[PDB]
């Protein structure tokens, strides 16, 4: 019985649909839903990906236990990179402080901005998010010993996630080589901070905690190599997502001056009570929030969510087998026509009380995913954007220095990022 799941057209290239997935993954995924519907597959090298879409299919996907759809082995490119977080830095009691930390990191970042100038959205926000994450999730003391170097290396790590990892995480290609060398540079970086603390024993941070943990032998339990990895781990899920979202929030505001105007008036109005960013970032900021939600629907940082099937299951009559990669796609589900009218349109109103399309499509509006394993950093990420823009939009006004269309994502790697250049002009309000 040579029966198989329905497969999307194409896949002609050497590694099937891989070549396409590295160029236009969203187009490939839309063609799957368009030709096959809710359940369809495409081939990534040797592996088959079972792409689920639509409310019913996604519900099955998100309500499944880690015993059915495991995430652990779904992203082999993470092994070389790495080599819970919630308890350490995401406790609600900590949000207020993180709001202040973030505000401080932003003001520090733009400190040399002056009157007017230009920045690159990817460069600015990517580095800014390294500082906010490192400062909040690990500690300011640690962040203060970091600079553009750490950021540049961390970026090489993210550019080391070419879909070819599904063939082998250690292929002798350039991106995988750069990835390994970059991590080697991150260890040298962390080791230097570690030796400074040991040679010269106060506010304590997560690095202090990891350095102090002793093995039963009495010897320290973690090496510089292991600490760097854990640190890379703590910041990975929150870095490229925040950087990208921040970039696309400013891009959309700039593309739609009407939304920009509204956000600005509301911020000046909100802050008119004299309270701080750490006070307002934890509280409602409607216009800004709806622009954010609309930015996440149109440009979700994770365009595909992966899993490895453990058992034998059936989704809408189609049979999934153990070993199959099962996948959900926020890029695709977030634009399903019947759930989000004019899906390709930037319509913040979509989330105002009268519609709240985000809450009426619990299994389709999945920029943060859904179910039990819905992004645990969601509240932090929202607070961060509020905190970041409360500072930027009040101090500076922005404008595009390139055609509106040239602002787009780079889909060559599993981790999505803004293509360059992404130049933007700024000027003090």
Give the footprint of ligand HEM on this chain (CB under 6 A): 71, 85, 90, 237-238, 241-242, 245, 296, 300-302, 305, 367-369, 373, 375-377, 380-381
CA distances from 300 to 209, 247, 287 (A): 34, 12, 19
CB 350 within 8 A of CB 340: yes
Q: How far is the CB of 251 from ligand HEM (least distance, A)?
A: 15
348, 288 in Cβ contact below 8 A?
Answer: no
15 is in an annotated binding site: no
Q: Which residue has the tokens 């059915």?
A: 68
Alpha carbons within 13 A on the beta-carbon side of 329: 27
User: Which residue's entry shows tokens 């979700």?
Assistant: 300
**Nearest distance, CB of residue 44 and ligand HEM, angstroms:** 16
> What residue is closest to ligand HEM based on CB?
377
Dist CA 331 CA 328 (whole Å): 9
Question: Residue 98 and residue 85: Cα distance in Å, rounded?
Answer: 14
307 in a labelled binding site: yes
Q: Which is nearer to ligand HEM, 11 or 330 (CB)?
A: 330
SS3 assignment, position 257:
helix
Nearer to ligand HEM, 85 or 336 (CB): 85
Query: In angstroms, what is the minimal distance from the CB of 243 to ligand HEM?
Result: 9
What minimum distance in Å lies between the beta carbon of 136 and ligand HEM? 8
If you ran DSSP here, which 8-state letter would residue 345 be given? S
State the minimum distance, in angstroms, from the CB of residue 210 to ligand HEM: 18
Q: Which is nearer to ligand HEM, 16 or 301 (CB)?
A: 301
Distance, in Å, from the CA atom of 246 to the CA atom of 205, rounded to the nearest integer, reads 26
Query: Is 375 known to sit in a ligand binding site?
Result: yes
The three-state secondary structure class of 208 is helix
Find the angle CA(168)-CA(126)-CA(71) to the nearest 5 degrees. Answer: 40
- For residue 313, list its beta bridge partners: 320
Nearer to ligand HEM, 189 or 292 (CB): 292
Is the CB of 227 or the CB of 298 nearer to ligand HEM?
298
Nearer to ligand HEM, 84 or 215 (CB): 84
Is 154 annotated in some ligand binding site? no
CB 155 within 8 A of CB 103: no
Is there a binding annotation on residue 221? no
**Residue 13: C-alpha distances to residues 7, 10, 21, 44, 67 (Å):** 15, 8, 11, 11, 34
Taking CA atoms, 16 is separated from 11, 26, 174, 413, 415, in Å, by 4, 16, 21, 17, 20
Does residue 240 sit in helix, strand or coil?
A: helix
For ligand HEM, which is the closer residue by CB, 332 or 381? Answer: 381
- Closest distance of CB 288 from ligand HEM, Å: 13
- Residue 185 or 313: which CB sits closer to ligand HEM? 313
How many helices and strands (H and E) does the chain possess? 17, 12
Give Cβ neighbours of residue 65 (< 8 Å, ≥ 6 apart): none
Minimum CB distance to ligand HEM, residue 423 (Å): 23
In a 10 Å sphere around its CB, with 0-12 CB exposed, 13-18 middle and 19+ buried, how is residue 388 labelled?
Answer: buried
The CB-of-406 to ligand HEM minimum distance in angstroms stands at: 23
Specify binding-site residues for heme b. 71, 75, 307, 373, 375
Residue ranges for the binding site? 71, 75, 307, 373, 375
């Amino acid at each position: 019985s040579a029966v198989a799941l329905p497969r999307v057209s194409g896949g002609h290239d050497e590694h099937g649909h891989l070549e396409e997935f590295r160029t236009d993954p969203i187009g490939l995924m839309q063609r799957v839903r368009d030709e096959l519907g809710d359940v369809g597959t495409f081939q990534l090298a040797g592996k088959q990906v079972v792409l689920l879409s639509g409310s019913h299919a996604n519900e099955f996907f998100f309500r499944a236990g880690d015993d059915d759809l495991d995430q652990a082995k779904a992203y082999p490119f993470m092994t070389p990179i790495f080599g819970m977080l919630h308890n350490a830095a995401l406790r609600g009691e900590q949000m207020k402080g993180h709001a202040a930390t973030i505000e401080d990191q932003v003001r520090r970042m733009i400190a040399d901005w002056g009157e007017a100038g230009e920045i690159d959205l990817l460069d600015f926000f990517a580095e800014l998010t390294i500082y906010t994450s490192s400062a909040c999730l690990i500690g300011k003391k640690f962040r203060d010993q970091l600079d553009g170097r750490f950021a540049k290396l961390y970026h090489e790590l993210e550019r080391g996630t070419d879909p070819l990892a599904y063939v082998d995480p250690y292929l002798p290609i350039e991106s995988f080589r750069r990835r390994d060398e970059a991590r080697n540079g991150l260890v040298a970086l962390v080791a230097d901070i570690m030796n400074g603390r040991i040679a010269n024993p106060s506010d304590r941070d997560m690095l202090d905690v990891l350095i102090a943990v002793k093995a039963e032998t009495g010897t320290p339990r973690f090496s510089a190599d292991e600490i760097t990895g854990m640190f890379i781990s703590m910041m990975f899920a929150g870095h490229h997502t925040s950087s990208g979202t921040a970039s696309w929030t400013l891009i959309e505001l700039m593309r739609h001056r009407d939304a920009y105007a509204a956000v600005i008036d509301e911020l000046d109005e909100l802050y008119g009570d004299g309270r701080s960013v750490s006070f307002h970032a934890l509280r409602q900021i409607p216009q800004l929030e709806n622009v954010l939600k609309e930015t996440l629907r149109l440009h979700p940082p994770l365009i595909i969510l992966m899993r490895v099937a453990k058992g034998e299951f059936e989704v809408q009559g189609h049979r999934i087998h153990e070993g199959d990669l099962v996948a959900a796609s926020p890029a695709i589900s977030n634009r399903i026509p019947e759930d989000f009218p004019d899906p390709h349109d930037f319509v913040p109103a979509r989330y105002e009380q009268p519609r709240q399309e985000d809450l009426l499509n619990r299994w389709t509006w999945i920029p943060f995913g859904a179910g039990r394993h819905r992004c645990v950093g969601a509240a932090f990420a929202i607070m961060q954007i509020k905190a970041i823009f409360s500072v930027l939009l009040r101090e500076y006004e922005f404008e595009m220095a390139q055609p509106p269309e040239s602002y787009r994502n780079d889909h060559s790697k599993m981790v999505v990022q803004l293509a360059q250049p992404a130049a933007v002009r700024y000027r003090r309000r």
